[model samples]
Target chain A: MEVQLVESGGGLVQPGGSLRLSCAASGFSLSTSGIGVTWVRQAPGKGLEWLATIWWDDDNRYADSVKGRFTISADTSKNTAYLQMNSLCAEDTAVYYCAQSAITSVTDSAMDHWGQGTLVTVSSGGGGSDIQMTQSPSSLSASVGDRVTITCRASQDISSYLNWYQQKPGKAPKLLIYYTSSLHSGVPSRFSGSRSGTDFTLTISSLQPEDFATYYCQQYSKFPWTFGQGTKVEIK
Target chain B: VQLVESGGGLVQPGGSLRLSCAASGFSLSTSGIGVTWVRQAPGKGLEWLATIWWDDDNRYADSVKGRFTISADTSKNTAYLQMNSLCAEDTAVYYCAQSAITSVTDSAMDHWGQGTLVTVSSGGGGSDIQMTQSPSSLSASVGDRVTITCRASQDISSYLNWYQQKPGKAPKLLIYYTSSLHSGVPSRFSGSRSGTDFTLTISSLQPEDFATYYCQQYSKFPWTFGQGTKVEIK
Candidate 1:
């Protein structure tokens, strides 16, 4: 079975209504039915959001959340399960996933499975969707030798706890900022981060096509990971 | 990351095969590279499933063995997994996995993709389950809050955490780094505890709470997501 989480707070519905984190799956059919399904959560800057779930053959869906009213349903044929929450709120905007239960002899590998994630932005525009960033250079035109400094500021203060990531199509998103000003794994020394109040700067000493750039800062304050939208770079 | 291609499925008995997904884009050929697969049951923990490599030919975690194999095709930006004998026990979603970081996890698994399922059945009989033990015994009752523990080598700071996976899909993170919940998480499902031994607890056992819970540590390299703890309300 394949799995993923369904978010319920700001990006989609509300902070206290019924919703479903659908782990719409692939790789199996009714012929492959019988496995179990589960639900998980990832808060904005925290860690994970593991809720409750149910087994397919149990003739019913099981859950582990405190609101106990959650339910699980599977199409057996389509190979998907639904993690339905009765209430919604602004606290449910993390990404969710689905997967199989664990077996003995092999405990750690229980999560040996995964699904491409679906971020359930709980709010439509959101309770006040006002998380801002440096848009002055939404589209920048730079030169090879221009000493450039892009200052992307957030609308609100995420404290100094912001991060940077590089996301190109196809490849998984790469981490550019860590703990605010720390550089990410294997990142070049030329890539630097500096934060002052609500303003954060990602400085590239020089320019390379890869370094020419688009960048974003996310607040680890709420997780599932919160991003500052993103900034793209161009050369004129 | 760039996965190779779509995998061809089949109805195998109780055995395994070297199946692969082809990937493109970027430079996928790097030494000490990692490859993995995650599975999602109809609605469940997007099982951390299995993985293999092509460097010096070393293998890491594959919780379900005796009928499982891991291999890679670095030449084509492809990786493969083979199960010796398949069974409904192996009937869940599967995914192509990555190290998320070159450091890998403590148990050597992390980061996942959209998964795929490998079903095992006799065509005639439907899903027939015969579960054995119940991992823990907190005798947890409703209204009472408790924590599920997952320990790691060093003090992964607050990396030790939890996950909830459903059947037929992929697994998602729940509680990571001590008690921080991802953005869309339920506060009632908050997690907390001490160092090394992390804990994830649902304030009450909701019907949907029956999901399989996994505890993981991401504070250090070679990250380690715990062997999931299956929760069944008594």
Candidate 2:
């Protein structure tokens, strides 16, 4: 359904305090229906983490890390689900998204449908530095069988969460590399990855025309998976 | 994580096809994550076919109901998708994605398999929404704000999504289900729907925004994609 996160302006909570975040939803019937409203968090420079979900039946599920001090609840009358967390800290700072989960057979593309997301900033010290990624000469041209090196430079140490994707026009992005250069199954051996300090590289040993497309890097190391703008590879 | 889809690529209309996704590295039965099957028609956008949870619970897109089955073999850490009575439109590249299962939501796909090619031969009519898009191309200067609209043949709910695609790269989800922008999309890109009509607006066009835009529907399976609309230099 058409879901809007009703941006709660911006979230700023002091340490050791309780915070209640609500996702006011519309466009779908949530009272009688069995659909679910869920909360996900993306910490800066990190990957997405599912926080909790509240079903119409009032059943709530929580991630291992969220269960202790975090509670998920919903108000069908107002078509909203609530994320209430206690003892806020710097690590809790990130973008929180409220989305509908596919709880029934008729539902498809669960998280694919989402809200605009709310930015939550936890007021605390000792937070890590912001991660900045860049690709030199954002676009490249190469011929078939030609070897090419595409580098992704993260301003700080974040190789642990780095992943790569290749996308052909009009198609969904494909995971070409994940978990710090480990290749996904069935990927051609020619597409290899390596890391050196803060610079990560995905090299195409024998590039084919089919490989001529856009490539992106995502890091789940922190929270809210961050993507490298994108690097285009065109037929030379 | 690794996903490997297995099955012959060819199938005849009126026949059935079974595709398997074998995943490794993650515990299929213990991770709490679900295995999802998605496909993309040759030269088209992505379509989520089905998802099979660790407990064996399955969900199908309404459009593929009755004709598709999603199953899993936990012992083998594998998931299966079977399509019955295939048609020409069924030809596409099928991939298996590991969907996160957590306290809040199972969201965007993170790990994906190298897609397996599946081609179905045409024989008769297929069950799918018939959709058409117009204004194949247009021009606007940088910094100009513009709205591109898509009209579907049937009145739909909130299943329409907007995408941006360059000449030879994959389509990026800009807005899904009418209005919410996909993560990473800039605020300049927005979407809205009025009944069967959907619109994608670029608040302030940037040089990078000049490209092809498309509209797609996921409310039902066998998703329909709009013919792309081009935004060029005015």
Candidate 3:
């Protein structure tokens, strides 16, 4: 079965605030399918975490730590799943994902199909602002060293939390850029990231064959992290 | 993180093969993370053969239920895949990967071993034409359209399928059984076939679309996959 999550949320909020996240998946029906959906996250420099999930029958489950303040709801008619977090803290900053699975029992693989992740950032900004992050061109192409640029535009200017990731098929996505423009440890020098005012950009100076993959921009300066829609890096 | 895959290089039909993946830099026993075994036929897309969870729970692909076994040794941080009654179609490269969970969670099969190749003899079914993928590598540009072909030595027209994969990740199903797109695939990807020849085509390729593509045929028992076709810049 095929399942794809397209958009992720982007927002800024102060401590003790509440946030709702949404994932847009295509090709699967929330109402009729027996398969279930889940909310997962990847914290900056940390591991992947299972936050919560909703079954086709409308059952709900949450990770031990998140159960207190997190809720999962779905709208089958819209084919979308919603994640709501209350009392957000900076520790909640990460790239959250919504994925599909054939988990009928406890021992299930839990994840067979996945949506491209979305980024939600919980900011310390006392002003509880709505999150807005959008990535453009949906896809991009360039040869080695051609200075390719992928941009993530956000409504709020929390540039310090901007980050980037690279994902190849069949493998876990890798952290490429974090803390605004800094490259992640061990990342090649050819790749760099930055935020100019409202624009968060990941730039590849000279692309290599290995550079071909999907790229995503994220914000981690606050809780309820958000990510930009992925951009495909195609061969020129 | 390091993963080492080892196994017998040859297996007789009706017999079995045991493969092991040794991991370093991570604890397999107590880490709560899972260990999974995946395989690719020669140069085909990846298949999630089996997974051994931290709690010892096992999950497998429907295609490999009765014939495959997945287990792990917590003390050794190692995992194993054993397939019984190996057939010629079983010959392929197998990889061991760590089930990395970010923060708390199938984060993804991220770190992978180089891979081990095994050859299995055709058990008594001598009529099956081995599947072959041609032009294992090609070049393309954004918005360019391309097609990769899979041919069977015998007539296996209706059973062909296609997959797309990039290094260090899981293979995504693009097309199945001649010309049907998998559930969530984009419209730009398609498949078609004639007689013994099957084709996977990408229309107006996107950047994320650059990767290796493979073809597999499920018409007969002991399914087979073709060598992958790598798409890069022309």
Candidate 4:
């Protein structure tokens, strides 16, 4: 009931550098029984990863993958929880989220509240040759039945090696258009993708109410695959 | 990459039913992989029931928590969903879905199996109330706003919920408690109450939004669902 979590302190960090992310909560007591502050992350183009959790009683538990370098703690006085990591690596590049959980056990309970998320990019300190994927019209509002088109530009021509996805808040992204112009099996035909030179477009011939969410374009043309910054389609 | 759902037939009220989902093209024992169970009442939307992870851990929806069991056997590459104390309300087509485990925060079901229909015969006398959805099916284009209505035979206040289901896929919750949007659902999808008449409106339609919508009421003992309204592309 009336819960909100805000995450902050996310940006570029070099390998082996230290990082601290904070989540400020409101409308509930952090020390309430059965409540826990949980940290979850998603590597670009990968599934979600449960990093750690700090329960009301100061009990902390972490995933095996992050056991050594990650620490989760909470300050009940300030209504804040923190995720601190040391010796960061490129593989740790992800969007970290702070969520409120109804903890019954390590594997039980439901996560009912979540923050907007903070993106942390772990770079290796090199101006490498990785291609950049840029999305235009970062966010827009439209009515149902309106035609919506989102564009993604690749630094270099990648032919038709792009894919499009739709993601709702707090949910994993779903692939819609793949291989540039081909629709993923079972995807509605009203959604299509096409490319011109280095610019690829994902067009919604008609916008449905449920279509008002965020969309991203990803490129698989080369190693170090990259994704666009995402475009949000809001209801007008 | 393939999942086949099995185990369907008639069951008596108070009996038990065990549904099976066989997997192929991938290893079910792989860490981080999860199998989920979903069910759809005749002409209604999908309801998520339970899930079992490769590590043998499991989770269930509160509605069926104590009475439902979700388990998997890596050796058989199969997952099982067992329901006890079956009732007429349990009649539905059950589907098994698979997703890569990533905690409960953002796990999305990516693969699904064709559903198997399970019918439960009526047992005892109860209220004969019904749920009716109008315009059982309609055609609309993207960007067009539309609303589906569910009318309960008796007053249920704000005890209604809505769901969207696509062909060959599990239904996803859209609105709950009459007007509250479900987590992760688009803001454009809203629900409202007018006594016994409830409405689920899509302010704008999207390409991937074409599907069947259903409304369910939990105010009564035998939870009842509305006949679905199918949204089709124009």
Best by lDDT: 4
Give me the candidate number with maximum TM-score. 3
Mind giving the per-residue lDDT tens digits that candidate 4 earns over B1-234? 778888888875445778888888987855325687767576443455776654556766544555578887878888888877554566888878775454433344556677788886643324634678987999999999999999988877677778676764434567777888767899889989887789999999999899888786656433456768889998
Cα error, residue B84 of model 4, in Å, equals 54
Query: Distance (Å) between predicted and true CA of B151, model 4?
Result: 34
Give the winner by TM-score: 2 or 4: 4
**Cα lDDT of model 1 by residue, A136-196, tens digit:** 4555767765556666677776776666666443333456666567765678888788888
Worst 10 residues of 2 chain B by lDDT: B100-109
A109 Cα displacement, candidate 3 (Å): 54
Docking class of 2: incorrect
List the candidate 1 regions with Cα displacement exceeding 4 Å. A1-135, B1-234
In candidate 2, what are the lDDT values of residues B1-234, reduced to their tens digit?
A: 677778847755445678888878876755234677777676554556676654545766543555678787778778788877454556888887876555233233556777788876532325555455567789998889888988877766877777676644334568766888777899989888777778898989999988888786656543456776888997
Q: lDDT order of candidates, best first?
A: 4, 2, 3, 1
Q: Please, what are the lDDT tens digits per residue for candidate 4 over residues A1-236?
A: 68888999899976556789999999998888888877877566443455777744445776544655678988889999999977565677888888776444432243446677898997645436767899989999999899989999999987777777786654445668767887766789999989999999999977899897788886656544466878999977
Docking class of 4: incorrect
Interface-residue RMSD per candidate?
23.9, 22.0, 22.5, 21.9
Q: What is the DockQ of each candidate?
A: 0.04, 0.04, 0.02, 0.03
lDDT tens readout by residue for model 2, A39-133: 76656644345577654344566654455567887777887778887745456688887767654434233454456677888663332554566
Q: Which docking band does candidate 1 fall into? A: incorrect
- TM accuracy, model 2: 0.31
lDDT of 1 by residue, B1-234 (tens): 445434435553433455676665544445325665555454332343444444555343333433456666567666677665444445766666454434322122223444555665435413211111124444555566655666554554553556676543355566555676765767878777664455676776666666667676434222334546666556
